[PDB]
Amino acid sequence: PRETWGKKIDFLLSVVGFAVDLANVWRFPYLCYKNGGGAFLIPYTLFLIIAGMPLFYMELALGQYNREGAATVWKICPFFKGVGYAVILIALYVGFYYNVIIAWSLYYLFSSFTLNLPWTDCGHTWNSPNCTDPKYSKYKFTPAAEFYERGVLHLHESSGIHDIGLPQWQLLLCLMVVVIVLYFSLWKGVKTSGKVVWITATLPYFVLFVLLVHGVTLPGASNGINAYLHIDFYRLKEATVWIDAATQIFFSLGAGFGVLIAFASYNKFDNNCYRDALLTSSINCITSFVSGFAIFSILGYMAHEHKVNIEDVATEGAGLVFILYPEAISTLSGSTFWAVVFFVMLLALGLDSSMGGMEAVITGLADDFQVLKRHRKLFTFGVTFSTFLLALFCITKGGIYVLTLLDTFAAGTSILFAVLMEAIGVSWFYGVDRFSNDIQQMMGFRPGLYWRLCWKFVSPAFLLFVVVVSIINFKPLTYDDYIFPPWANWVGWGIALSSMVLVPIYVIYKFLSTQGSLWERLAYGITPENEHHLVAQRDIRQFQLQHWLAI
């Protein structure tokens, strides 16, 4: 038999935990402030209505009706099974470098258990002789900036991607703890994974409330809030503002990454997933908007402290969280209670997203091979051990150069291409009319005209607009003032093409393996596996023009 969620609340907290991560904190408020302030919410809320929710609703109903993972859900259109293998490999690529970012948060949490924070003075063994006591965002000779690039990263001992060196033993030990925690929270299925999210999915909300209450009291906090929610309606006349909201919506919801389809496969058949699609989509977007109030309270406080403008302090991820917040924290009364709670919140943010991505591989692959389904504990050991071994490249002395390469090419054009092909198969080849008949089979109500129009015309067109734009607006690899060698770009494109080439390859294998006439091998690959008996009866739905004209 197939296991199910112990309680309904377990499923809701798993989806919310995977959807909310560091991207909702260290990226979104900066984009809103830079683009249009309060006018950036118009294209942001528009793409959620027409593209964010239709894809979220589509994926949740796909797993519940079929009760299969990402790879093997394509029994409805056997020619598209290569798309499932593309999202599984992409989910493996992200794990090779996302657990390193979590290791940084654990390294900062272990250094906060003292009465003298390491990032306050310029008298340690990791300090350059030019360290100076405190565009403030570009200065690299401050105590907080010298503890990140010379105390944790050890970047000053590397000359580029041509010579990275041996892994750091301090960072290696922190990576070991993360993988062990990940294994024991995933080795028993969803009976154990459904209880871990009771703490990790709710802890950041508790800390964010306390940080917000104290944040608005600090001097200069009002200036940061006022500049955060300004209105500039003339910024909507530029095409870059609309593209910025289009990429943020697709990458912050995580719809089509193979995680939501696995979660919904353990749901009950009669569960109402139309309600779940709207509720969990809105919590993710509301969390991003609320988090900007707490962040810009600190930014306004920092600008008042240094007697500079708010435009000289604003930063983005990995420069605001690890270089900027520790500097402001070191002056807030206790300065130790605040340090502990801040880095505890980061751990709770990232742990849920790593669990969700790894389950998309175990559930997807165990549903393809039956032998793997019978050994869950041993198979979970293989996935985590491979992640730990292949993540040793990102904890070396030149580890940020490798992490930058993987971040650009593992996702992006490859993941945008796979989701575009998945929507085409379900909406057009499988049939929108058939899809709505399956939803009415479980819930008892047909979706409607608005939802059917967004699945067949609007969502495929929105995805195609982001795929083309991503290719056109591509630049060679760089990091700060370091320019990557030309060969490093060819290796980057090889990683991206590895997932994409899988889709055409499976079509050739499926065609060349099945027997029959030329027009017979084509019919088997487009007919659902449970409706193969009518192929020989010379009545194929997809071979009539009436099928393709459905709206």
């Binding site: 970012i101 910025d244 760089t478």
Partner: peptide
């Protein structure tokens, strides 16, 4: 934004 290239989880000055 212009002059800042963002990928999935991190942004770099391009």
């Amino acid at each position: 934004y212009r002059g800042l290239c963002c990928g999935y989880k991190l942004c770099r000055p391009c």
